[PDB]
């Protein structure tokens, strides 16, 4: 399968979906932390939010990273498959 390019790209798609899903969850959690519809700052703390924002951003980058790498791997497998058939004209 790390030999099947159509599959890697598919896998990339999945991780992209995961990335979208996390971004949307992070955005809903942001709103909830802020806690709004007069509501004063009895809501979620400033330092915890920063931890969260950071954790979310890490997760999204890692997810983007796996996507990117799979896409690059597919591209790399095709480039070499193609180069191989040429050498054997």
């Amino acid at each position: 399968f790390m030999t099947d390019p159509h599959a890697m790209r598919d896998m990339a798609g999945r991780f992209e979906v995961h990335a979208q899903t996390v971004e949307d969850e992070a955005r809903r959690m942001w709103a909830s932390a802020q806690n709004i519809s007069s509501g004063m700052a009895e809501a979620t703390s400033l330092d915890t939010m920063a931890q969260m924002n950071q954790a979310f951003r890490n997760i999204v980058n890692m997810l983007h990273g796996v996507r990117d790498g799979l896409v690059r791997d597919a591209n790399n497998y095709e480039q070499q498959e193609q180069a191989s058939q040429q050498i054997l004209s």
Binding site: M11, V22, M29, A33, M52, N58, I59, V66, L70
Partner: protein, 48 residues
């Protein structure tokens, strides 16, 4: 609202578990899983 935040965190962890399934399906990459874990755990912690 503290209820919403707990429900969201529960949903976040389902998503984390969903991700682990895909990672496994995409067979020294045990660090990806560990780091992934850490960050979700941090989010989960701060929301209980």
């Amino acid at each position: 609202h503290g209820a919403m935040i707990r429900a969201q965190a529960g949903l976040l962890e389902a998503e984390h578990q969903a991700i682990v399934r895909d990672v496994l399906a995409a067979g020294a990459c045990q660090e990806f899983i560990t780091q992934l874990g850490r960050n979700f755990q941090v989010i989960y912690e701060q929301a209980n």
